[PDB]
Amino acid sequence: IQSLTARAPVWLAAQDTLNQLCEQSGETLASSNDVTEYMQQLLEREREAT
Amino acid sequence: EMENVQKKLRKLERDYYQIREQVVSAKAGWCAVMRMVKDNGVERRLHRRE
Amino acid sequence: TIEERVKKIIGEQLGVKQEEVTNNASFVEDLGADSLDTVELVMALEEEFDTEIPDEEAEKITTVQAAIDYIN
Amino acid sequence: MKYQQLENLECGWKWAYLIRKHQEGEPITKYIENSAAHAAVDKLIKLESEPVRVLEWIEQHMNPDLFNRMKQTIRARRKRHFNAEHQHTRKKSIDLDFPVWHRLSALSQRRGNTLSETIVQLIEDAERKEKYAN
Amino acid sequence: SHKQLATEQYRHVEMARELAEQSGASSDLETDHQAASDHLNLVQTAMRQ
DNA sequence: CCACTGTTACATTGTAACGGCA
DNA sequence: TGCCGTTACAATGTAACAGTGG
Numbered sequence A: 001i002q003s004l005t006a007r008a009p010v011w012l013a014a015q016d017t018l019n020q021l022c023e024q025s026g027e028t029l030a031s032s033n034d035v036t037e038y039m040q041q042l043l044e045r046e047r048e049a050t
Numbered sequence B: 001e002m003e004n005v006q007k008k009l010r011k012l013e014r015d016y017y018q019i020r021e022q023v024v025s026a027k028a029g030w031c032a033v034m035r036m037v038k039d040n041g042v043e044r045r046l047h048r049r050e
Numbered sequence C: 001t002i003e004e005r006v007k008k009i010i011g012e013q014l015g016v017k018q019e020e021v022t023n024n025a026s027f028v029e030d031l032g033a034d035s036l037d038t039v040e041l042v043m044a045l046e047e048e049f050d051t052e053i054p055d056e057e058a059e060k061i062t063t064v065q066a067a068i069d070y071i072n
Numbered sequence D: 001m002k003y004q005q006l007e008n009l010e011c012g013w014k015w016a017y018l019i020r021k022h023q024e025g026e027p028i029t030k031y032i033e034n035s036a037a038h039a040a041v042d043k044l045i046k047l048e049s050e051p052v053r054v055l056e057w058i059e060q061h062m063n064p065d066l067f068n069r070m071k072q073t074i075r076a077r078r079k080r081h082f083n084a085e086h087q088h089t090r091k092k093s094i095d096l097d098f099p100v101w102h103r104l105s106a107l108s109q110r111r112g113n114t115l116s117e118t119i120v121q122l123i124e125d126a127e128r129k130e131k132y133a134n
Numbered sequence E: 001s002h003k004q005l006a007t008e009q010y011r012h013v014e015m016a017r018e019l020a021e022q023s024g025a026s027s028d029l030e031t032d033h034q035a036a037s038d039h040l041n042l043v044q045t046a047m048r049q
Numbered sequence F: 001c002c003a004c005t006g007t008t009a010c011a012t013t014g015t016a017a018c019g020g021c022a
Numbered sequence G: 001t002g003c004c005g006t007t008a009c010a011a012t013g014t015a016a017c018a019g020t021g022g
């Protein structure tokens, strides 16, 4: 219980940040790889719009 | 000897009584703030569960 | 009457109004009060009537009507 | 140290206290000449919304004789601010007719207890007398 | 602790009751032994005569 | 009836005096 | 000693109740 409690705040802040970031986008993220493909799509949209 | 323990039980009872008023007053105060903050404030803005 | 206590306190503990609570419904799920909220509700009921309610009796108040059933 | 001190709160308290005293006519500053006192008071007035500089203002222009009064006023303000959160820690103020207060204070001084302790003991004895009779 | 103290009070009551019973038994035995001592004295006197 | 007065029970802020403690 | 909690006040402001007479 104490180990999980120590881990908790970091995980909770991470979850909140991730939820805000994904909701800002139309997509919801679920994996590190998925974040990487989102970055690739971001780069594609950037290189187009420029 | 046991009458002393009975008196200690009475002391614990009064302490419980006190904690109980504290808790009920806290919930009474909470009620209204929940009711107002349910205008999207509590959804994610105020409730920084971190 | 004396039930005005319960039907008042309940609302004051759950955010609903006097008429919102329905006797057929249940506090646990039909009022939105979770475990902690129901504990707070039962403990406020205990405080109001200056009495005591053990755990066993206290657990049988999940429904609206029970709050008066043990009282009266 | 029992109550933690918060700068942005105690500094606002100090600013409000000094403004109140100035409005009341108290000489806030150590400058007898009216021009310097008025200039310092204007500096304070425009100094609102600043803890880190109201503290320095106090260090530099504050009247020497008001330091103790301000310190004890802030002590009381801090204690009351922290105690006003919970019901059991709050304090209830009442007015007692002079004879009753005189007798109660006589008892309290005689027994070495405070007013609260003396009244608690007396009420407990009254209850005990009731039980004795009953 | 409240239930424990109430139960200990009940146990105390029971032991107090049984010791009251023993006190009554002691009183009865005291009467009987008074009679016995009287008998002893009578027998002593009869032997002397 | 209605208004005005007297009184009690608080709150609010400020202050002086003790006593604990580094 | 100087800070810090703590007590016992003082002064003023308010709400609420009870009276009084027009």
Ligand SMILES: *P(=O)(O)OCC(C)(C)[C@@H](O)C(=O)NCCC(=O)NCCS
Pocket (backbone or CB within 6 Å): C034, C035, C036, C037, C039
């Ligand atoms: P729920 O997620 O609202 O949590 C409720 C609770 C675990 C915090 C607690 O209030 C509760 O309901 N406990 C059940 C009763 C209990 O544990 N009683 C112990 C008596 S010593």
